[PDB]
Amino acid sequence: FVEMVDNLRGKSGQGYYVEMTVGSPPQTLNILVDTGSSNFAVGAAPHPFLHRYYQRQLSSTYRDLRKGVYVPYTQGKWEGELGTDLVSIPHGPNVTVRANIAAITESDKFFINGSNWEGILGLAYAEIARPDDSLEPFFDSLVKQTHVPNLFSLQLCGAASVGGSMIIGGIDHSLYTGSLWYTPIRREWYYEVIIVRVEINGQDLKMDCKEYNYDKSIVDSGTTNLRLPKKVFEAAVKSIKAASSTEKFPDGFWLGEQLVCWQAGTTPWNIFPVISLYLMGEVTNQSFRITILPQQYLRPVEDVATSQDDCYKFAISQSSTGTVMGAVIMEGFYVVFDRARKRIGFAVSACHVHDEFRTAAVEGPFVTLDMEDCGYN
Numbered sequence: 001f002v003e004m005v006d007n008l009r010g011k012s013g014q015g016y017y018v019e020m021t022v023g024s025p026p027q028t029l030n031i032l033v034d035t036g037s038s039n040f041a042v043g044a045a046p047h048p049f050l051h052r053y054y055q056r057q058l059s060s061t062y063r064d065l066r067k068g069v070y071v072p073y074t075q076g077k078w079e080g081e082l083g084t085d086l087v088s089i090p091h092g093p094n095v096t097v098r099a100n101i102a103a104i105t106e107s108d109k110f111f112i113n114g115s116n117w118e119g120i121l122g123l124a125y126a127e128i129a130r131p132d133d134s135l136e137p138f139f140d141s142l143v144k145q146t147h148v149p150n151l152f153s154l155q156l157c158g159a160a161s162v163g164g165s166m167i168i169g170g171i172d173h174s175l176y177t178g179s180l181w182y183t184p185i186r187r188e189w190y191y192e193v194i195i196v197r198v199e200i201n202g203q204d205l206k207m208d209c210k211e212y213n214y215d216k217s218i219v220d221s222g223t224t225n226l227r228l229p230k231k232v233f234e235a236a237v238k239s240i241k242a243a244s245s246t247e248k249f250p251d252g253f254w255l256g257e258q259l260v261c262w263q264a265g266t267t268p269w270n271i272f273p274v275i276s277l278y279l280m281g282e283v284t285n286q287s288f289r290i291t292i293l294p295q296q297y298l299r300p301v302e303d304v305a306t307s308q309d310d311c312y313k314f315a316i317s318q319s320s321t322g323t324v325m326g327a328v329i330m331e332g333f334y335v336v337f338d339r340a341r342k343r344i345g346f347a348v349s350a351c352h353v354h355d356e357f358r359t360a361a362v363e364g365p366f367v368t369l370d371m372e373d374c375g376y377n
């Protein structure tokens with residue numbers, strides 16, 4: 001799948017985008033890859049932050065659905081006009097499909113000033129499509145209309161700019177080492193999974209596992225951070241604050257409220273612990289674990305334009321909507337979204353940034369009992 005390798009570009013913290021064309025003749029746009037939403041939505045008006053926008057007047061294959069969509073969220077919103085048009089991915093399979101497109105005509109704190117992307121490609125399921133599950137997501141359209149197998153895979157490579165690979169319709173063996181390990185997709189809405197055990201430095205947090213998945217755990221390329229439920233994040237940092245005693249830091253640091261800095265290069269990775277998430281396996285009583293480094297959860301902030309050292313945001317933080325395995329997780333791994341078999345695969349990435357003493361890993365099998373129980377109803 002060589003034509004697809006390295007088809008993702010981005011800047012640190014601003015997400016990963018892929019080049020897409022919409023309409024006839026084709027209009028090129030950069031489109032954020034988002035496994036945490038299900039709408040294909042593109043800027044359609046000259047917002048000042050946008051390099052470019054979808055011009056429906058130029059497209060002979062444009063069809064109006066004559067229906068609006070309104071998408072509110074915490075700090076903002078986007079809204080627009082539903083329609084369909086012809087859509088392709090130049091560095092993706094060699095096919096063109098008719099997909100639903102939300103033409104965004106108003107938004108608040110949605111677009112990033114300084115970023116080079118102009119829309120979002122929600123790769124998750126119809127269940128969370130807006131305004132409702134009858135709006136067929138792009139990837140469902142793609143599979144329905146071509147012979148492209150029902151799966152895609154992501155290698156997010158992380159670095160000011162980032163690259164990676166979205167392989168649509170298959171798996172590229174050169175993007176990973178060792179074996180793939182699969183965790184079941186518990187339900188087709190978000191890419192929901194079940195974490196069954198957590199260890200910081202080989203030490204079990206010994207929380208009821210149900211806590212880990214309260215009330216969801218999801219895989220999300222649209223989120224930078226590893227995000228954790230309040231009750232689990234308290235426990236996580238308690239053990240993280242404790243594994244890292246040689247040095248102390250502001251309390252706000254841990255709340256993602258202040259930054260932390262050391263003399264350039266002088267960052268002590270090693271006083272920071274590895275974190276291991278055991279996921280539900282394919283077999284009864286069987287699990288596997290993925291292990292990430294501090295080099296994954298301490299992410300270097302380029303933008304302190306009032307600083308001269310090495311400052312990082314603690315990239316773990318809390319939620320009311322459950323665990324989110326964002327780019328901090330995904331960047332250590334090759335992630336396989338095997339929709340045809342309702343499972344997600346993880347292997348060690350051939351690109352993840354490794355150091356002398358400690359390495360990201362995917363290991364199994366382990367014996368874990370009562371893994372169902374870990375899920376929330």
Ligand SMILES: CN(C(=O)CCCn1c(N)nc2cc(Cl)ccc21)C1CCCCC1
Pocket residue numbers: 015032034035036037071073078110120220221222223
């Ligand atoms: C505000 N945002 C987020 O909080 C991202 C985290 C959750 N999330 C994801 N993955 N896709 C999203 C789409 C919307 Cl409309 C709102 C939240 C989203 C998104 C704004 C649009 C681009 C991705 C970040």
